[PDB]
């Protein structure tokens, strides 16, 4: 089936501007045997991990391969992949590198810090490491920047051969490269490049152009995959618009009784600013008694209506303190909606006026 292979889907498309800059950093560190640290930043979704994994899976003591120099030579290059979030402690990052480079047949030594790791790379061979997400290495200013500062000094001194290529998330400083996000024309080329192995293309050229500009890479994959599951569940240009609309509305989904309490919640926050659940219940009772419409409700059932607004996403209830003489812990009520859409939905029924 053509619908099963489409939903499942060394130069990456829309990335030739940064691929040449990445390979240029290794042309001076393996050929000249110089240690240097690299820093890669950018927002999540720019394809940083997919770019580094493609180079190792193409043009690249366990874990030993060969790298092709531009002039034409051969060198023993060891490339490994170690994630920072997939560890237990940030201070034990030196032991994982030893297990990924040293063979299992030899003796397994224990590494404590820099003094135990620098002596191992002295006799040796270009050791390439890929530290993904280096922002989590800090200890959540003096003791926080300790693992990053120690790893940077290990890949800066000579006499050894250790390169460092990290991929963070947005005179011995690393080369910072900002990953530019994909635009409308950049996201459209990757779609045709990834689906080039498929014989038939059921997508329209005008539908991918709309999803590429509205998402400006992980967000685009969820949009195209959702259009296939929707079309196959009911049996084009309109297929791309249904994925952005299926994922004023929160007010019409409520009852008339819940709208009366909600109208009194925002009213109490205007003439009193900071208000609690006990003060909001007293303002709602005295507001409906002057109109003499609808039966009142007890304080025990007052929290049931506010729970509906919290689940939908209209009233945020937090726990703070007071500001007066009795500064005790109390439950405060707050909102997070716009005043333009609030004064337009309740006015269409033409049944409530003093409650707004």
């Amino acid at each position: 089936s053509i619908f099963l292979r489409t939903k499942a889907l060394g130069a990456l498309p829309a990335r030739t501007a940064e691929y040449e800059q990445v390979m240029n950093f290794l042309a001076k560190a393996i050929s000249e045997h110089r240690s240097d640290s690299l820093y890669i930043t950018g927002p999540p979704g720019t394809g940083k991990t997919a770019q580094l994994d493609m180079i190792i899976r193409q043009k690249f003591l366990q874990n030993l391969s060969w790298f092709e120099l531009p002039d034409g030579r051969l060198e023993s290059v060891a490339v490994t992949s170690i994630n920072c979030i997939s560890l237990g402690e940030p201070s034990s990052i030196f032991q994982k590198i030893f297990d990924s480079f040293q063979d299992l047949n030899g003796p397994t030594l224990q590494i404590k810090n820099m003094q135990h790791l620098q002596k191992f790379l002295e006799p040796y061979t270009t050791f390439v490491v890929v530290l993904d997400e280096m922002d989590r290495l800090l200890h959540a200013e003096t003791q926080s920047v300790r693992t990053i500062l120690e790893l940077f000094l290990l890949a800066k001194l000579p006499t050894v051969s250790f390169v460092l290529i990290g991929m963070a998330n947005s005179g011995l400083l690393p080369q910072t490269i900002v990953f530019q996000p994909y635009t409308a024309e950049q996201m459209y080329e990757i779609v045709i490049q990834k689906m080039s192995s498929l014989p038939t293309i059921i997508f329209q050229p005008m539908a991918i152009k709309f999803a590429a500009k509205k998402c400006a890479l992980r967000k685009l994959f969820d949009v195209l995959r959702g259009s296939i599951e929707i079309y196959e569940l009911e049996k084009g240009l309109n297929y791309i618009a249904k994925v952005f609309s299926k994922f004023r509305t929160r007010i019409a989904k409520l009852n008339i009784q819940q709208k009366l309490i909600l109208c009194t919640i925002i009213q109490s926050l205007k003439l009193n600013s900071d208000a609690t659940i006990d003060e909001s219940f007293d303002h709602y009772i005295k507001a409906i008694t002057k109109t003499d419409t609808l039966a009142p409700l007890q304080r025990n059932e007052f929290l049931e209506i506010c729970t509906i607004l919290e689940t939908c996403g209209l009233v945020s209830i937090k726990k703070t303190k007071c500001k007066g003489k009795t500064k005790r812990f109390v439950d405060k009520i707050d909102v997070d909606l716009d005043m333009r859409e609030f004064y337009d939905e309740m006015t269409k029924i033409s049944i409530l006026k003093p409650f707004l």
Partner: protein, 457 residues
């Protein structure tokens, strides 16, 4: 143990097929809770109604077809996806996913889709938040490792292992908000594995709020879940009607053989017919949907209404435990009135004079200064001030000898039982202070409902 899966074999190609191993993917406490019965359980005509109304899919059509279609396009195609389920607590979130896995298990036996393994991981059913790695590794591999060894073993298995020697794994992430930690390392690892090529892992996350990744999680974990989210809308008034009628389809409007000796009813000696009024179902499902739309609340209302009617039916006849039974609207209305009522008002009206005087003295101090924070020394001075109002009259001095001397000449004029009583009842509050004069006293309940109890005395 402490050895991860990366050091179990020699290389990548040296790993054999995991599907032909009698240990991967699952390849004694039900006998001690059994005893012999030396009597006979007499079941009345209302016993079968309560058992069918218990929690142990006609109102879910679009939600059941969306989850089933998301997994059918990934298991057969050998891919990985992430399904997000959010809604009100009690709308059939876990039951909808359980029906999808149960429907996919029947299609796998017909040689249509490849075999998969269903893993149920609940966040609230675990003591430590890091215990989810040991449960998943024990159901897939079969070994017993720690939280640090199971985390590194799942990463090496969901990446370097090819698809020709793997198998689809369906993991239901029940209670997604329970696994939220501070470092956000467990939540990110469970969603990053679905983005890998050689993964074949189906993750179905079930939470309670649609804006959970946008409030607790960051931009990195939100981009790995997906933009398409399934919102489980609560049940209204026309959907809860067929839910109760389905559980009591073969019991409603049916004749029973209730015995006049013991009270045992046999579903097809008198021919007692059980019928439940349709108006009692409409007035009960409308009140449930107007509060939160809980599916368990709609079944508990009819169960509580049948329990009250069964109590009056057994007491009027004298049966025991060892013409037409019609459940009117009175039993349903009484089942909802026992919960919406407030017992705080009637609690203060049955207190003693010493407990009622402390509440009346606290409310009078609030109308003089208006600070909502009266000290303990002001309540004592206000109580004595109300006693000396008419001290010259013989009608008021009769209570002064008891509250200050207990009717004894040897007992001196006093200046703790009613103070600590209201503190444990959730009505009165007291700050942590070593002094008994400047200690502020605050009210926890409302002020409107507190004045109604003082006027009733």
């Amino acid at each position: 143990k402490y050895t991860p899966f990366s050091k179990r074999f020699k290389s990548i190609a040296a790993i054999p097929d995991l599907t032909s191993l009698p240990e991967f993917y699952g390849n004694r406490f039900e006998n001690k809770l059994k005893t012999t019965q030396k009597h006979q359980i007499v079941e009345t005509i209302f016993s079968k109604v309560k058992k069918q109304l218990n929690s142990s899919l006609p109102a879910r059509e679009n939600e059941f077809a969306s989850i089933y279609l998301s997994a059918y396009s990934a298991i057969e195609s050998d891919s990985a996806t992430t399904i997000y389920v959010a809604g009100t607590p009690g709308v059939g979130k876990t039951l909808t996913v359980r029906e999808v896995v149960k429907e996919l298990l029947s299609s796998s036996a017909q040689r249509e889709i490849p075999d998969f393994l269903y893993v149920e991981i609940n966040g609230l059913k675990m003591v430590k938040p890091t215990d989810c790695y040991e449960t998943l590794w024990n159901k897939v591999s079969g070994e017993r490792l720690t939280w640090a060894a199971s985390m590194e073993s799942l990463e090496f298995y969901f990446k370097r292992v090819p698809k020709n020697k793997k198998k689809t794994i369906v993991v239901l992430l029940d209670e997604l908000d329970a696994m939220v930690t501070k470092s956000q390392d467990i939540m990110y690892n469970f969603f990053n594995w679905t983005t890998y090529e050689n993964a074949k892992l189906i993750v179905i996350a079930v939470a309670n709020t649609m804006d959970l990744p946008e409030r607790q999680l960051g931009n990195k974990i939100t981009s790995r879940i997906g933009f398409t989210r399934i919102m489980f809308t609560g049940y209204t008034h026309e959907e809860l009607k067929n839910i109760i009628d389905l559980r009591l389809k073969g019991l409603n409007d049916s004749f029973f053989y209730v015995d006049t000796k013991t009270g045992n009813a046999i579903l097809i000696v008198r021919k007692v017919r059980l019928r439940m009024s349709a108006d009692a179902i409409e007035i009960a499902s409308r009140k449930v949907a107007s509060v939160s739309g809980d599916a368990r609340r709609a079944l508990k209302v009819c169960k509580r209404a049948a329990e009250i009617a069964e109590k009056h039916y057994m007491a009027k006849h004298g049966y025991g435990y060892d013409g037409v039974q019609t459940v009117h609207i009175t039993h349903v209305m009484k089942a909802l009135n026992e919960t919406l009522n407030s017992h705080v008002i009637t609690f203060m009206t049955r207190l003693s004079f010493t407990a009622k005087l402390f509440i009346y003295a606290l409310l009078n101090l609030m109308k003089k200064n208006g600070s909502q924070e009266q000290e303990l020394g002001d309540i004592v001075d206000e109580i004595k001030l109300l006693i000396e109002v008419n001290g010259s009259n013989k009608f008021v001095m009769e209570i002064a000898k008891t509250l200050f001397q207990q009717g004894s000449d040897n007992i001196s004029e006093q200046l703790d039982f009613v103070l600590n009583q209201l503190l444990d009842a959730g009505i009165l509050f007291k700050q942590t202070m070593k002094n008994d004069r400047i200690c502020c006293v605050k009210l926890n309940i409302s002020v409107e409902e507190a004045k109604r109890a003082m006027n009733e005395d």
